[PDB]
C-alpha cells in the first residue's frame, strides 16, 4: 500500500520540522541575581475596555495574586474574561463568548478597543530595557477591515503591530491562553465541576493538563509505524521477487520513526508521572482544609481517576462516591485546583461557581479557593462571581482583591 | 547484492560479539538490546577490569587469607602478612593483573577520554568478589614508604571503585572502601580523583558521590573553588556551568544537576531562586513532542528536589 | 543496653504498638510524597528521594513503614530473572543500578543507621520514628502458623498509604503477604539455606542476590524487636510464670513458632545445616523446597551471569547466616527462667545444643566446620558459641573415646587456672590425645575428629583469652604445665607422624596456641 | 513403595521378631492360595521381620510361603504397590506435584490396555512414510488407500472407548470439584497426530489463576494437592483395586483447602461400597469434621494411662465399638 508509505514519509517530515523548531529555540532567562515573596512580572495590572460588549470605556485594576470581580450576572460579568482571552490572543471558537468578533463590538459603534497592561517592573521581565516597567497590549476590533494590534510601551511607542510578538511575550510569561482550562468560562466550569463518573474525571484531568493530545499523537504515530512495518515487509518480498532507492528511503524513515517513538514514549511517561504526582500532592494538601485525608489514583486498566477520602468518623478510606453532596463538591473543587497546579500558569481566570454548591459547602469552597490561591505569587487568579465575598468573614486576609462593580 | 547490512546494528552487534571475553551462549537478544540503545548510555561505562580474572591464583590467595597463623585483624604495619602475598603477587601491579586489569592500563592509571575509555561496552569478563579484592589491595597499602607508592595505590583504588562492574557488584556497606578512604586525607583523595577523571565528567562525579556522599561539598570545593573562581562565588560558577551545558545542549552531562543538589550551595526547598531559574530554563526548552529524554528527566528531578523541604 | 532499646521520650504508645511515634509536619509531607510517588509506580524517584538526602544532612529522612515493605518487595525483583520488567519500568537507567539493588542498599544502610543511635549525628525524634517504622513493618511481617506442605492496617490517619489499594509491586506480591502464608516463611528459610551452597547458577543467584541479605535484615530487625519487647512490653517485676507466658508471645517466639515441626531439636538441627557436608543420620525425610517468587530458578536470556564466587566465599557466608539463625534461637532461649520452659515453642537449650553438636561433630569437611567456628567478633557471638564448641568437643570425645570426661570449661572461662587444669586433665586422659584404638585404615576419619577437637578447644581458648587476657600464662605454673602438656600431646601425635601411615602431617595445634598464648612455643625458640 | 528401606526400624529394639497380621475378605476369583478354600471368606497375611534371618518369608493363614505367592495374590486382587495411583507416598506426592500432560496420557493409556496406542502410533508412522513416498512419486498408487482404510478403521475402533472414558472422568472431576466451587474437566485433546494427544485439566479454584495445566510453581501447594487428590479419587471406582492408600495427605494445606478436601472425602465416604483410605494426620487441625461413617484412631499415650500390655482394655487404640457388645 503506497498510501501507508506516503503517510510514513509525511509523519517523518513532520518530525523533522518539529526537531528543527526545537533546535532553533535558545535560552531566554538570564538569571538576574537581585535579592521570593514578591510576585514575578507578567501579571495584569489593569484592563480598560472602550466600547466593548455592553458597558462603556471601563478601567479595572486587577490585583497581583487573587482577584474577586463582583460584577453581577447579566451586567457583562463575563466581559472581562472574554476581553482578556481575546487581547492575550486566543481562537474565537475556543472562547465561545459571542457569535463572532463583530458582535463583541458595542452596538452603535464600529470599533472596540481592548487594552491590557502587563507588569514588567518586577523580576522575570521580558526585555525590561526596551519595554520598560509595563507592556501595553491593545487590540482593535472593527466591523470593517481586519482586527488591528499594537504592543506599545508606557511612552506610547508602538514596539510592534504583528501577532507573533504576542505569542513570544505570552510564552515567555507562560500564559496558557491556548489551553481552555486556564481561562474557565461558565459552561466549562459547570462541565468540570459536575463530573460524576471516574471516567469523566480522568477525561477532564487528562484533557486540561494537555496529556490527552500527547497520547493521541503517540498512538497515531504508533499505528502509522505498525502499518508501515507491514508494508515494509511486503516491499521486501516484492524487492526480492524483482526499488532499492525506495527501500532505503522507507527503511531509513522506519528506523527514525522507531527511535522517535521510543523517545516520545519515555517523554510521555515522565510527563504523565510528574503531572499526576503534582496533582496528587496538591489534592492531598487541599483536603487538609476540611480535616480530611485523601488521594488520587489514576488507572489505565479502567481508564479512570478514583478519589479516596478519609473523614473524621470512619477509619477506612471509602470511595469518594460513597459520600455526601458537600464532601463531593469540595472534592471536585480540590480536583479543579489540583489540575490547575501541575500546569504552572501565570494567569488563571474563572467564572461563577456559586450555583454548583449550596449554602455552607459554597462558603467552604470559596474559603478553599482563597486559602489555596492567595499564597502563590507566581499565579494571578481572576475569579468572577456574583456573590458578594465581603459577606464572607474571610476577607481580612491580605493578597485578596475584591472589585465590586458599583454599576449593577 | 545491494542490500548487505541491517540498519547499523549489524556491524555494532558483530563487533560486540567478537570482543566478548565470555565462554558461554551470549544470546542474540542480549546483543540486540545492548547495541540498539541510541537514547541512554546504560551499557557504555568506565571498565577498569577488561580481562578475565585469574580465578585460580585469587582463590589461592583467598584460602591463604582466610586461614593463617595470626588469625587476627591485619594491621597497617608489619608488611600486611608478607610471607605468602609476596610469594604469590610481589607487586600491586601483579595483583591488578590477577584482578583482570591489563598491563597497559596498570602502567597508566587514567581514564583516556580520547580513546573513549569512559564509554565502552561491557566486556562480559568475570570478576572476583569485591570485598576480597579490596582486602588483597589493602595488603599493599604500606603506609611507611615513599609518596609515589601511596599515590599509585590511591589512584588504583579510585579507578577500581569507579569501575562499572565493581560498582554494580559492590556491597551495601562500603566498610573496606570507607577504611581505604580514611587512610588518606580527604583533600588528597579529591585531588587524586580529579587527576584521574575529567573535571566536567559529572557522571563519574555522581557515581563517586553515590559511593561516598559525605565528599560532596569537598568535591564542589575542588570543582568551583573560590580562589580558582577569581572573585566569583561558587554559586555563580555553578550557574555559569549550568548555562554552558544548557547552551551546548549536553543534556546528559547537564543531568548528572544530580551532583549539585543537596549541598550548601544548591539546597532542596521550594523558595530557592536557583532551582526556580533552572526549572524556568528547562520549561523553556522542553517541548514534550520531539525532545531528548534528559530534558523530561531534568524536569521531573527538579520538581522533586523543589518539593523536598 | 543502648539507646535503641531505652529511648522512649517521643513515643506515644497505643494498643497495637508501644513504640508508636506521632508525625510532624515535615515528616508527614515526606510520607505523603513517598506514597504518592509509589502510587504512580515511580519507584526510581522514590529511591532517588531517599538517596539524594542520605548522609548529606544532620537531620534524617525517615522511610515510612509501607515504603519499607515496598522496598522489601523490590529487593525480590532481581535482574537475573526480572530484567525485562525492570528495563520496561525504567528504560533510562539514570542510576546505572537495578531497582532491587538500590532498594536493598537503602534497606541495609537504614538498618545500619537504626542499629546504633547517634543522637549527635541525628536528632532523637527521627531515630525513634525510624525505629517505629521498622517495628511496624516487622509486626506486619508476622509469620503464619507453620504448615508442613488482616489485609492492611495503617496506624497513621494523617495520610493514605499506597499499600491500601494494591498487593503487587511489579508483578511480585508483597513480601508480607507472601510470607503471611502458612508454609512460606520456613520455605523461604530452607530455600535460602539450601541455595546458599548450590553450584547451579540460578539457585545460587537467587540465594546470593535476594534472600540472604533479606534474611540478614529480617533477623536483625527481629532481634531488635525482641530486645524492645523484653525491655518494655513485659511488666518488669513478675512471678516468673507470667514472664514465660509473655516470652511465648515475644517476636522471636512467633518467629521460631513457624519452625516447630514435630521435634524441634533434630528438625531444627537439619534445617539450619541444610545442604551441608554432614552425613544425614537416621535417614531423615528430605525437606521440599520451592522458589518463593515464580521463576527465581530461571535466568532470563538478556541477563548474563558474569560473577564467580569461590567455594570458601559461599561457605563462609552461608555458615555466617546459619550462625545468625542459631544465635537468634539462643537469644530467645537464654531469657527462659530456669526450671520453666516455653509454652508455645517446645524448645529447650540443652536439646538445641545437643542437636547442633551432633550435626557439627558429623561434619566430614573441615572447611565448613572452621567457617562456623571462626567469627570476626568474639563478643557478639559470646553467649552461645562457647556452648556449641564445648558440646561438639564432648560428643567428639564420646565417639572417639569410650570414657566421656565431663567438660566444665564454659564456667571455667571465669578462672583461667581452672580451664588450664581441665585441659591438663583431658590431655593426660589421652582423650584429647590421638587415640590408639583407631586403625591404620580409618586414620583419615580419626584425623578429622582430632582436627575438629582442636578447633573446638581453640575456640574455647580464644574465649578464655577474651575473658581473662594474658596475665599468668607463666606466672601461674598451671598454665605453663598446660602448655607443656600440649607439647606432650604434640609428641604423642608426632609418634604416629613418624609411624608414617600417611605423608600428610597430622593436625598439631602447638604452633597455634604458641601464636595466641603459648609465648611462641614457650622457651623452645624464645630462649 | 518409593521410600528408603529400613527393616530394623520395624523390629522392636531388643525383640527378635516383629509381626504384622492383616485379614481380608476372600472371593473365589484368586488362585494360588494355601489352606484357604475358594468359598472361604478369610485371607490372613502375616509378615515377620527378624535381624538374624535375611529372606522374604510371608504367611498365608499362618502358613509359611515365599514372597512370590503373596505377590501374585496381590496382583490377582487388582491392587498394585509400585503403581502410584493405588499407593501414595511423600515421594509420590512430590512426583504428582510437578506432573506433565505426557504423564497423564501415560497413566490413562496404562490403565486401559496400551496396545491400542502402540498400534495407532505404528499406523500413523506408516501414514507419514506412505505420504513421503507419495510426494516422492509426484505400485505406489495402489498404496495409501489400504493404509488409509486401515488407519480409519483403527481410529473408528479407538475413538468411542476413549471418548466415553474421558467423558466419565471429566464428569467425576466436575462432581468432585463442585464442593470447591470450581469447574474442571479432564479433557483429552486429540490433534491429527495420535502421539500428540495430550491431557488438559481446567482449574477454577482460584480466580486469579488462569486455566492451565497443573504445576507446583505457579499454583499454591494446597489447591494443587486438593486437585491431585480429587483426580486420584476419580480413578478409584473404575479401578478394581480393593482400596487406595494415601500418605502425608491430611497434613495441613492452608486449613482451608485441607478443610474442603476433607469435606470431599466425607462426601465420598457417604457413598457405600467405597475404598478404605489409611489417612495420616501429622499436624493437628482445629475443628476437624468427623463423619459418622468414618472413625478416628488415636495412638498417643498418657503418663497416667497404664501400660497397654498390662491393661486388657488399653490394647485397642482409637476404637469405641470394641467396648460395646457386638
Question: CA B149 to CA C166: how far, in whole Å?
Answer: 57
Cα D107–Cα D109–Cα D115 angle in degrees, nearest 5: 145
* Beta strands per DSSP E along C56-118: none
| A71 marked among binding-site residues | yes
- D273: three-class secondary structure by DSSP: coil
Contact B9, B15 (CB under 8 A): no
Using CA atoms, how far apart are residues D81 and D242, in angstroms rounded to an integer?
12
Three-state helix/strand/coil letters over chain A: CHHHHHHHHHHHHHHHHHHHHHHHCCCCCCCCCCCCCCCCCCCEEEEEEECECCCCCEEECCCCCEEEECCCCCCCCCHHHHHHHHHHCCCHHHHCCCCCHHHHECCCCCEEEEEEEEECCCCCCCCHHHHCCEEEEEEEEECCCCCEEECEECCCCECCCCCHHHHHHHHHHCCCCCCCCCEECHHHHHHHHCCCCHHHHHHHHHHHCCCHHHHHHHHHHHHHHHHHHHHHHHHHHHHHHCCHHHHHHHHHHHHHHHHHHHHHHHHHHHHHHHHHHHHHHHHHHHHHHHCCEEEEEEECCCCEEEEEEECCCCCCCEECCCCCHHHHHHHHHHHHHHHHCCCCCCEEEECCCHHHCCCHHHHHHHHHHHHHHHCCCCCEEEEECCCCHHHCCCCCCCCEEEECCCCC
Residues D254, D262: contact at Cβ < 8 Å?
A: no
CB pairs under 8 A between A and C: 42
Give residues with Cβ within 8 angstroms of A260, minimum separation 6. A15, A221, B290
Cell of B81: 602478612
The cell for A399 is 493578597
How many other C-beta atoms are found inside a 10 Å radius of the C-beta of residue A199? Answer: 13
Give, as one character, the DSSP assignment of residue C164.
G
Helix (H) or strand (E) holding C275: none
Q: Has A179 been labeled as part of a binding site? A: no
Which residues face A350 on adjacent strands? A184, A383
CB D45 within 8 A of CB D33: no
Q: Is C131 exposed, middle or buried (0-12, 13-18, 19+ CB in 10 A)?
A: buried
Integer CA distances (angstroms), D16 to D8, D51, D315, in order: 10, 6, 21
What is the torsional sign of CA C249, C252, C254, C256? negative
Cell of D320: 469405641
DSSP code of residue D57: E
Which residue from C148, C412, C198 is spatially nearest to C318, judged by alpha carbons? C198
User: In Å, how far are C65, C146, C329 from C142, measured between CA atoms?
Assistant: 14, 12, 17
Q: What is d(CA C219, CA C214) in angstroms, rounded to the nearest whole number?
A: 9
* Residues contacting residue B132 through CB under 8 Å, at least 6 positions apart: B58, B61, B62, B65, C310, C313
Which experimental method was this entry solved with?
A: cryo-EM
Beta-bridge partners for D246: D88
Contacts of C520 (CB under 8 A, 6+ apart): C514, C526
Q: Residue A27: what are its φ and ψ, rounded to 5°?
A: -85, 140
Where do runs of H (alpha helix) occur along C145-184?
175-179
The C-alpha angle with vertex A94 and arms to A172 and A328, in degrees rounded to 5, equals 95
Is A273 an interface residue toward C (CB < 8 Å)? yes
Of C106, C111, C103, C110, nearest in space to C82 by CA: C103
Check if the beta carbon of residue D251 is closer than 8 Å to that of residue D283: yes
Residue matched to cell numbers 507573533 = A164
B133/chain A closest Cα distance in angstroms: 39
The C-alpha atoms of residue A142 and residue C168 are separated, in whole angstroms, by: 63
How many residues are present in chain B? 309
What cell does D58 get? 510371608
* C-beta of residue D165 within 8 angstroms of C-beta of residue D210: no
Q: How many CB atoms lie within 10 A of CB A375?
A: 12
Which CA distances in Å does B200 have to B9, B197, B252?
30, 9, 12
**D215's grid cell:** 504445576
Integer distance in angstroms from the first to the last C-alpha of chain A?
66
Q: A392 is written with which cell numbers?
A: 464572607
CA distance B156 to B195: 12
Rounded to whole angstroms, the Cα distance separating B156 from A221 reads: 50
> β-pairing, D245-246 with D87-88?
parallel
Query: Nine-digit cell at D117?
Result: 496406542
Nearest residue to B14 (alpha-carbon basis) of B35, B38, B45: B35
Considering only CB atoms, which chain A residues are within 8 Å of B277? 29, 31
| DSSP one-letter code for D14 | T
Contact between D262 and D289 under an 8 Å Cβ cutoff? The reply is: yes
CB contacts of A266 in chain C (<8 Å) are: 91-92
Please tell me the distance from the alpha carbon of residue D275 to that of residue D239, in angstroms, as a whole number: 10
CA distance to partner chain C, nearest, from residue D268 (Å): 23
Burial of D21: CB neighbours in 10 Å, binned 0-12, 13-18, 19+ = exposed
Residue A52 has phi, psi (to 5 degrees) of: -115, 120
The DSSP output letter for C230 is I
Backbone conformation region of residue B21, classed left if phi is above 0, alpha if psi is from -120 to 50, else beta: left
Q: Please, are residues C510 and C518 in contact by the beta-carbon 8 Å criterion?
A: yes
Cα–Cα dist C237/C233, whole Å? 12
* Cell numbers standing for residue B259: 551532583
First CA to last CA across chain B, in angstroms?
Answer: 64
CA distance A119 to B49: 60
Verify whether the Cβ–Cβ distance D251 to C285 is below 8 Å.
no
Q: What are the φ and ψ backbone dihedral angles of A71, each rounded to 5 degrees?
A: -65, 120
Residue A31 Cα distances to A35, D15, D111, angstroms = 11, 99, 86
Q: CA geometry: angle at A102 spanning A100 and A106, to 5°?
A: 120
CB atoms within 10 A of CB A364: 17
Q: C-alpha cell of A177?
A: 491562553
Its sign, for the CA torsion A33, A39, A43, A48, is negative
The Cα D174–Cα A331 span in angstroms is 50
Residue C341 near residue C427, CB atoms below 8 Å = no
H or E stretch covering C130: helix C124-140
Residue with cell 596456641: C513
> Contact A298/C40, CB-based, under 8 Å?
yes
**C355 and C265 Cβ atoms separated by less than 8 Å:** yes
CB contact under 8 A, C290 and D216: yes
Residues facing residue D65 across a β-bridge: D58
Phi, psi of C161 (to 5 degrees): -75, 155
Name chain C contacts of B261, Cβ cutoff 8 Å: 52
The answer to whether residue A277 neighbours chain C at the CB level (below 8 Å) is yes
Looking at residue D179, the DSSP 8-state letter turns out to be: T
* Cell numbers found for residue B33: 538490546
Rounded to whole angstroms, the Cα distance separating C33 from C39 reads: 10
Q: Which residues contact C71 (CB under 8 A, 6 or more apart)?
A: C63, C103, C104, C106, C107
Which residues contact residue A16 at a Cβ distance below 8 angstroms, ignoring those fewer than 6 apart?
none
Contact assignment for C96 to B124 by CB distance below 8 Å: no
Q: Please state, in angstroms and rounded to a whole number, the distance separating the CA atoms of residues A367 and A373.
A: 10
**Beta strands across the sheet bearing A134-142:** A58-60, A44-50, A111-119, A134-142, A148-150
Residue positions counted in chain C: 527
Q: How far apart are CA C356 and CA C359, in angstroms?
A: 5
Q: Angle CA(A209)–CA(A213)–CA(A217) in degrees, nearest 5?
A: 150
In this complex, the residue of A281, A295, A310 whose CB is nearest that of residue C157 is A310
As a whole number of angstroms, the distance between CA B241 and CA B177 comes to 31
Nearest chain C residue (CA) to A314: C157
**What is the DSSP code string of chain B?**
-----STTHHHHHHHHHHS----S---HHHHHHHHT--S--TTEE--S--S---HHHHHHHHHHHHS-SS-SPPPSSTTSSHHHHHHH-SSHHHHHHHHT--HHHHHS-S--TTTTTTSEE-----B--HHHHHHHHHTT--SSS-HHHHHHHHHHHHHHHT-HHHHHT--SS-HHHHHHHHHS-HHHHHHHHHHHS-TT-HHHHHHHHHH-GGGHHHHHHHHS-TTTTTTS-HHHHHHHHHHHHHHHT-HHHHH--TTTTTSSSS--SSS-HHHHHHHHHHHHH--SSS--HHHHHHHHHHHHHHH--
Which helix H or strand E contains D251, and what residues bound it? none
CA pair distance A271, A212, nearest whole angstrom:
12
Q: Which residue of C145, C285, C290 is in closest CB contact with D217?
A: C290
Provide the resolution (angstroms): 3.2
Distance CA B41, CA D319 (A): 76
Judge contact between D144 and D158, C-beta under 8 A: no
Nine-digit cell string for C38 = 509509589
Chains in touch with D (3+ beta-carbon pairs under 8 Å) read C
Neighbours of C474 (CB within 10 A): 13
Let me know if chains D and C touch, i.e. at least 3 Cβ pairs under 8 angstroms: yes
Q: Pick from C36, C37, C164: which is nearest to A317 by CB?
A: C164
- What CA–CA distances, in Å, run from A90 to A44, A87, A205? 17, 8, 21
CA distance D180 to D263: 9
Cβ-defined contact of D253 to C147 (cutoff 8 Å): yes
CA dihedral B151, B152, B155, B156 (to 10 degrees): -150
Residue A41: closest CA among A165, A169, A206: A169
Tell me the CA distances in angstroms from B227 to B221, B233, B259, one per residue in order.
10, 9, 21
Distance CA B160, CA A169 (A): 52
Amino acid at each position: 500500500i503506497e498510501q501507508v508509505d506516503d503517510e510514513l514519509l509525511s509523519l517523518t517530515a513532520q518530525q523533522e520540522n518539529e526537531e528543527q523548531q526545537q533546535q532553533r529555540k535558545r535560552r531566554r532567562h538570564q538569571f538576574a541575581p537581585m535579592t521570593l515573596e514578591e510576585s514575578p512580572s507578567g501579571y495584569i495590572k489593569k484592563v480598560i475596555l472602550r466600547n466593548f460588549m455592553c458597558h462603556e470605556h471601563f478601567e479595572l485594576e486587577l490585583g497581583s495574586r487573587l482577584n474577586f470581580i463582583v460584577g453581577n450576572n447579566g451586567s457583562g460579568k463575563s466581559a472581562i474574561l472574554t476581553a482578556i482571552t481575546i487581547g492575550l490572543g486566543a481562537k474565537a471558537s475556543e472562547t465561545n463568548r459571542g457569535s463572532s468578533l463583530k458582535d463583541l463590538i458595542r452596538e452603535g459603534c464600529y470599533s472596540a478597543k481592548i487594552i491590557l497592561h502587563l507588569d514588567n517592573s518586577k523580576y522575570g521581565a521580558y526585555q525590561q530595557g526596551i519595554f520598560g516597567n509595563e507592556i501595553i497590549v491593545e487590540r482593535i476590533i472593527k466591523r470593517d477591515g481586519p482586527a488591528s494590534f499594537s504592543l506599545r510601551s508606557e511612552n506610547g511607542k508602538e514596539i510592534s503591530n504583528k501577532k507573533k510578538d504576542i505569542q513570544t511575550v505570552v510564552d515567555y510569561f507562560s500564559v496558557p491562553v491556548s489551553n481552555p482550562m486556564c481561562f474557565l468560562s461558565q459552561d466549562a466550569a459547570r462541565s468540570f465541576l459536575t463530573a460524576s463518573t471516574s471516567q469523566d474525571k480522568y477525561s477532564h484531568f487528562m484533557k486540561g493538563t494537555l496529556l490527552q493530545e500527547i497520547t493521541e499523537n503517540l498512538l497515531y504515530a504508533s499505528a502509522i509505524h505498525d502499518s508501515a512495518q507491514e508494508n515494509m515487509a511486503l516491499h521486501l518480498e516484492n524487492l526480492k521477487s524483482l526499488g532499492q532507492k525506495k527501500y532505503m528511503e522507507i527503511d531509513e524513515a522506519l528506523n527514525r520513526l522507531h527511535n522517535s517513538l521510543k523517545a516520545r514514549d519515555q517523554n510521555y511517561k515522565n510527563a504523565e508521572k510528574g503531572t499526576c504526582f503534582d496533582a496528587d500532592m496538591d489534592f492531598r494538601a487541599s483536603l487538609k482544609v476540611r480535616k480530611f485525608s485523601g488521594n488520587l489514583s489514576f488507572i489505565k486498566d479502567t481508564k479512570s481517576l478514583e478519589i479516596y477520602i478519609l473523614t473524621t468518623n470512619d477509619e477506612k478510606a471509602r470511595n469518594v462516591d460513597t459520600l455526601s453532596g458537600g464532601e463531593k463538591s469540595f472534592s471536585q473543587m480540590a480536583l479543579l485546583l489540583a489540575t490547575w497546579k501541575p500546569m504552572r500558569s501565570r494567569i488563571i481566570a474563572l467564572d461563577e461557581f456559586d450555583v454548583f454548591m449550596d449554602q455552607v459547602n459554597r462558603k467552604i469552597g470559596t474559603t478553599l479557593i482563597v486559602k489555596k490561591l492567595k499564597d502563590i505569587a507566581r499565579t494571578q487568579t481572576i475569579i468572577i462571581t456574583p456573590q458578594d465575598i465581603g459577606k464572607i468573614a474571610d476577607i481580612d486576609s491580605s493578597g485578596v482583591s475584591i472589585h465590586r462593580m458599583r454599576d449593577p | 547484492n545491494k542490500s548487505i547490512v541491517i540498519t547499523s546494528n549489524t556491524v555494532a552487534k558483530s563487533e560486540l560479539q567478537k570482543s566478548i571475553k565470555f565462554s558461554g551462549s551470549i544470546p542474540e537478544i542480549y546483543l540486540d538490546v545492548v547495541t540498539k540503545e541510541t537514547i541512554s548510555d546504560k551499557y557504555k561505562d568506565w571498565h577498569f577490569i577488561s580481562k578475565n580474572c585469574h580465578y585460580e591464583q585469587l582463590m589461592d590467595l583467598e584460602m591463604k587469607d582466610t586461614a593463617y597463623s595470626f588469625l587476627f585483624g591485619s594491621s597497617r604495619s608489619q608488611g600486611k602478612v608478607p610471607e605468602f602475598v609476596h610469594l604469590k603477587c610481589p607487586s600491586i601491579t601483579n595483583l591488578l593483573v590477577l584482578f583482570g586489569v591489563n598491563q597497559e592500563k596498570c602502567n597508566s592509571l587514567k581514564i583516556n577520554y580520547e580513546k573513549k575509555e569512559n564509554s565502552r561496552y561491557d566486556n562480559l569478563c568475570t570478576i572476583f568478589p569485591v570485598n576480597k579484592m579490596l582486602k588483597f589491595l589493602m595488603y599493599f597499602y604500606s603506609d611507611d614508604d615513599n609518596d609515589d607508592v601511596r599515590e599509585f595505590f590511591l589512584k588504583a583504588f579510585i579507578c577500581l571503585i569507579l569501575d562499572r562492574k565493581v560498582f554494580n557488584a559492590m556491597e551495601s556497606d562500603h566498610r573496606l572502601c570507607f577504611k581505604v578512604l580514611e587512610l588518606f586525607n580527604e583533600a588528597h583523595f579529591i585531588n587524586s580523583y580529579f587527576e584521574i577523571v575529567d573535571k566536567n565528567d559529572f557522571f563519574l562525579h555522581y557515581r563517586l558521590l553515590q559511593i561516598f556522599p559525605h565528599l560532596q561539598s569537598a568535591l564542589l570545593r575542588r570543582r568551583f573553588s573560590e580562589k580558582q573562581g577569581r572573585t566569583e562565588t561558587i554559586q555563580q560558577n555553578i550557574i555559569k556551568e549550568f548555562n554552558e551545558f544548557f547552551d551546548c545542549k549536553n543534556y546528559k552531562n547537564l543531568l548528572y544537576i544530580l551532583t549539585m543538589y543537596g549541598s550548601k550551595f544548591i539546597p532542596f526547598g521550594p523558595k530557592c531562586q536557583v532551582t526556580e531559574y533552572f526549572k524556568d530554563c528547562i520549561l523553556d526548552i522542553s517541548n514534550e513532542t520531539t525532545n531528548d529524554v534528559e530534558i523530561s528527566i531534568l524536569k521531573g528531578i527538579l520538581n522533586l528536589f523543589s518539593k523536598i523541604r | 543496653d543502648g539507646a535503641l532499646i531505652n529511648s522512649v521520650l517521643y513515643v506515644s504508645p497505643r494498643n497495637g504498638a508501644h513504640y508508636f511515634v506521632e508525625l510532624t509536619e515535615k515528616h508527614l509531607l515526606a510520607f505523603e510524597m513517598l506514597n504518592s510517588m509509589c502510587l504512580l509506580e515511580n519507584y526510581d524517584h522514590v529511591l532517588l528521594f531517599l538517596e539524594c538526602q542520605f548522609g548529606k544532612s544532620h537531620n534524617l529522612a525517615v522511610i515510612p513503614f509501607d515504603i519499607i515493605l515496598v522496598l522489601f518487595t523490590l529487593s525480590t525483583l532481581s535482574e537475573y530473572y526480572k530484567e525485562p520488567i525492570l528495563r520496561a519500568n525504567d528504560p533510562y537507567n539514570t542510576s546505572r543500578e537495578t531497582l532491587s539493588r538500590r532498594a536493598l542498599k537503602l534497606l541495609q544502610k537504614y538498618l545500619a543507621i537504626l542499629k546504633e543511635f547517634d543522637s549527635e549525628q541525628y536528632n532523637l525524634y527521627d531515630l525513634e520514628l525510624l525505629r517505629c517504622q521498622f517495628f511496624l513493618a516487622i509486626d506486619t511481617l508476622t509469620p503464619k502458623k507453620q504448615k508442613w506442605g488482616k489485609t492492611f492496617k495503617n496506624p497513621y490517619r494523617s495520610y493514605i498509604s499506597c499499600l491500601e489499594q494494591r498487593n503487587t509491586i511489579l508483578g511480585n506480591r508483597l513480601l508480607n503477604l507472601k510470607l503471611n502464608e502458612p508454609g512460606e516463611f520456613i520455605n523461604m528459610i530452607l530455600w535460602t539455606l539450601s541455595n546458599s551452597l548450590q553450584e547451579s547458577t540460578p539457585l545460587f543467584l537467587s540465594s546470593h542476590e535476594i534472600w540472604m541479605p533479606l534474611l540478614e535484615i529480617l533477623i536483625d530487625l527481629f532481634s531488635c524487636r525482641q530486645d524492645y519487647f523484653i525491655q518494655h512490653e513485659v511488666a518488669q517485676n513478675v512471678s516468673k510464670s507470667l514472664f514465660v507466658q509473655r516470652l511465648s508471645e515475644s517476636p522471636l517466639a512467633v518467629f521460631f513458632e513457624s519452625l516447630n515441626t514435630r521435634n524441634f531439636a533434630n528438625r531444627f538441627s537439619e534445617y539450619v545445616f541444610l545442604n551441608c557436608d554432614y552425613k544425614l543420620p537416621s535417614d531423615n525425610y528430605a525437606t521440599p523446597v520451592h522458589p518463593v517468587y515464580n521463576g527465581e530458578n530461571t535466568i532470563v536470556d538478556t541477563y548474563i551471569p558474569t560473577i564467580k564466587c569461590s567455594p570458601l566465599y559461599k561457605s563462609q557466608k552461608s555458615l555466617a547466616l546459619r550462625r545468625k539463625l542459631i544465635g537468634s534461637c539462643f537469644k530467645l532461649l537464654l531469657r527462659v527462667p530456669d526450671g520453666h520452659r516455653l509454652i508455645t515453642p517446645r524448645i529447650v537449650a540443652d536439646d538445641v545444643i545437643q542437636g547442633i553438636s551432633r550435626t557439627l561433630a558429623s561434619f566430614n569437611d573441615i572447611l565448613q566446620f572452621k567457617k562456623f567456628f571462626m567469627t570476626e567478633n568474639l563478643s557478639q557471638e559470646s553467649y552461645f558459641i562457647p556452648l556449641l564448641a564445648e558440646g561438639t568437643l564432648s560428643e567428639i570425645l564420646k565417639d572417639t573415646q569410650e570414657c566421656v570426661v565431663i567438660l566444665t570449661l564454659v564456667e571455667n572461662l571465669s578462672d583461667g587456672v581452672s580451664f588450664c587444669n581441665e585441659v591438663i586433665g583431658l590431655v593426660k586422659s589421652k582423650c584429647f590425645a590421638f587415640t590408639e584404638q583407631c586403625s591404620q585404615a580409618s586414620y583419615e576419619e580419626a584425623v578429622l575428629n582430632i582436627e575438629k577437637c582442636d578447633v573446638c578447644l581453640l575456640v574455647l581458648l580464644r574465649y578464655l583469652l577474651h575473658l581473662i587476657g594474658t596475665e599468668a600464662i607463666l606466672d601461674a605454673k598451671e598454665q605453663l604445665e598446660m602448655l607443656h602438656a600440649i607439647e606432650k600431646n604434640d609428641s604423642g601425635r608426632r609418634q604416629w607422624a613418624k609411624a608414617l601411615n600417611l605423608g600428610n602431617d597430622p593436625p598439631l595445634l602447638y604452633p597455634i596456641v604458641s601464636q595466641m598464648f603459648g609465648v611462641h612455643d614457650k622457651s623452645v625458640i624464645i630462649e | 513403595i518409593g521410600r528408603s528401606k529400613k527393616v530394623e526400624d520395624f523390629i522392636k529394639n531388643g525383640q527378635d521378631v516383629s509381626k504384622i497380621e492383616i485379614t481380608l475378605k476372600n472371593s473365589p476369583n484368586v488362585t494360588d492360595i494355601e489352606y484357604i478354600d475358594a468359598r472361604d471368606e478369610t485371607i490372613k497375611i502375616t509378615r515377620i521381620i527378624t535381624r538374624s534371618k535375611r529372606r522374604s518369608d510371608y504367611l498365608i493363614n499362618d502358613y509359611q510361603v515365599s514372597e512370590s505367592v503373596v505377590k501374585t495374590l496381590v496382583a490377582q486382587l487388582n491392587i498394585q504397590l509400585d503403581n502410584l495411583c493405588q499407593f501414595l507416598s511423600q515421594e509420590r506426592v512430590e512426583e504428582f506435584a510437578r506432573l506433565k500432560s505426557v504423564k497423564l496420557l501415560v497413566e490413562t493409556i496404562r490403565s486401559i490396555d496400551a496396545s491400542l496406542l502402540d498400534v495407532l502410533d505404528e499406523l500413523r508412522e506408516l501414514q507419514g512414510n506412505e505420504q513421503s513416498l507419495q510426494k516422492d512419486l509426484d505400485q505406489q498408487s495402489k498404496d495409501l488407500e489400504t493404509i488409509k482404510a486401515k488407519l480409519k478403521e483403527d481410529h473408528a475402533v479407538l475413538e468411542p472407548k476413549l471418548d466415553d472414558i474421558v467423558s466419565k472422568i471429566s464428569a467425576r472431576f466436575a462432581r468432585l470439584f463442585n464442593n470447591v466451587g470450581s469447574a474442571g474437566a479432564v479433557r483429552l485433546e486429540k490433534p491429527k497426530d495420535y502421539a500428540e494427544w495430550k491431557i488438559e485439566i481446567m482449574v477454577k479454584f482460584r480466580d486469579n489463576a488462569p486455566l492451565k495445566k497443573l504445576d507446583s510453581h505457579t499454583q499454591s501447594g494446597g489447591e494443587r494437592a486438593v486437585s491431585t487428590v480429587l483426580y486420584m479419587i476419580a480413578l478409584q471406582e473404575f479401578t478394581s483395586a480393593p482400596f487406595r492408600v494415601v500418605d502425608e495427605i491430611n497434613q495441613g494445606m492452608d486449613s482451608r483447602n485441607e478443610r474442603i478436601v476433607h469435606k470431599a472425602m466425607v462426601e465420598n465416604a457417604c457413598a457405600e461400597n467405597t475404598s478404605q483410605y489409611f489417612l495420616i494426620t501429622p499436624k493437628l487441625l482445629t475443628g476437624l469434621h468427623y463423619h459418622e461413617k468414618m472413625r478416628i484412631h488415636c495412638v498417643m499415650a498418657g503418663s497416667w494411662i497404664p501400660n497397654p500390655s498390662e491393661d486388657p482394655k488399653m490394647i485397642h487404640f482409637g476404637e469405641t465399638s470394641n467396648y460395646s457388645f457386638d
